Amino acid sequence: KRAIDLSRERDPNFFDHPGIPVPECFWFMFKNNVRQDAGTCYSSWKMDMKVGPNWVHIKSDDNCNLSGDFPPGWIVLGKKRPGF
Amino acid sequence: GPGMKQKIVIKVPMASDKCRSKAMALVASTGGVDSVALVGDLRDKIEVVGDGIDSIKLVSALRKKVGHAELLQVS
Amino acid sequence: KQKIVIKVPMASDKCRSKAMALVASTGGVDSVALVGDLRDKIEVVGDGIDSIKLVSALRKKVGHAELLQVS
């Protein structure tokens, strides 16, 4: 697809590792509005992720909204996992 | 991630199922690793959780033993 | 898809490394977690894994592996 709609995106592949808290969010990475990858991440947290050509520091708020300086054509978007 | 554990994600070579399994074995074998999982939309990445893991040393070890590897996430 | 849990008595971190490498190398594996106070229980999730053969391989390579769960 080429219009982002997180309500219709299939859940990412994930593993809720037993040694750590269960992350609250799913993230989805797009290039030209085309899904490239997806996974889990913590709410109210931060991560460094390779987004196309760049390392990007991505912050999450309490509602799984993500912020970062994404390279042209790319975006990473969050949403709450079921039960969160 | 929150607390004392590290989570990183490394893209591993997809030459074959056996190659991907060799990468899994190398990471799982590494000191201070608690858990490993195949992740990514194409199941081409290893997510590893533990403490005292040297992500850059692990990339180098995967490139030596298995095939090309790329760090993609630290959290 | 199944979740298999095996206890592998560990003499050292060399034992843990060998056991984790063997399990993670197994065809059909999605995830491996080393759990327990003594990091001596292995949780493996995946498809088409022969739990008895995996216990036999651990008994040969490492130590007296014990099957705890297959679900």
DSSP annotation string for C39-71: T-EEEEEESS--HHHHHHHHHHHTS--EEEEE-
Residues 6+ apart with CB under 8 A from B34: A17, A18, A19, B5, B49, B50, B51, C33, C34, C35, C39
Instruction: Output the CA–CA distances (angstroms, integers) from residue B65 to B45, C16, C64, in the order listed.
Output: 16, 20, 29
The strand pair at A46-51 and A54-60 is best described as: antiparallel
Burial degree of B16 (CB within 10 A; 0-12, 13-18, 19+): exposed
CB-closest option in A13, A23, A47 to B73: A47
Q: What is the H or E stretch that residue B27 is in?
A: helix B17-28
Residue B24 sits at the chain C interface (C-beta within 8 Å): yes
Pairing between strand A25-31 and A34-41?
antiparallel
> Domains in chain B: how many in total?
1
Chain A partners of B50 at a C-beta cutoff of 8 Å? 19
Chains in contact with C, counting 3 or more C-beta pairs less than 8 Å apart as contact: A, B
Contact B69, B56 (CB under 8 A): no
Considering only the beta carbons, identify the residue of B31, B33, B35 that sits closest to C31.
B35
Tell me the residue range of the domain where C17 lies.
1-71
Resolution rounded to one decimal, in angstroms = 1.3
Are the beta carbons of B67 and B12 closer than 8 angstroms? Answer: yes
Interchain proximity B36–C22, CB inside 8 Å: no
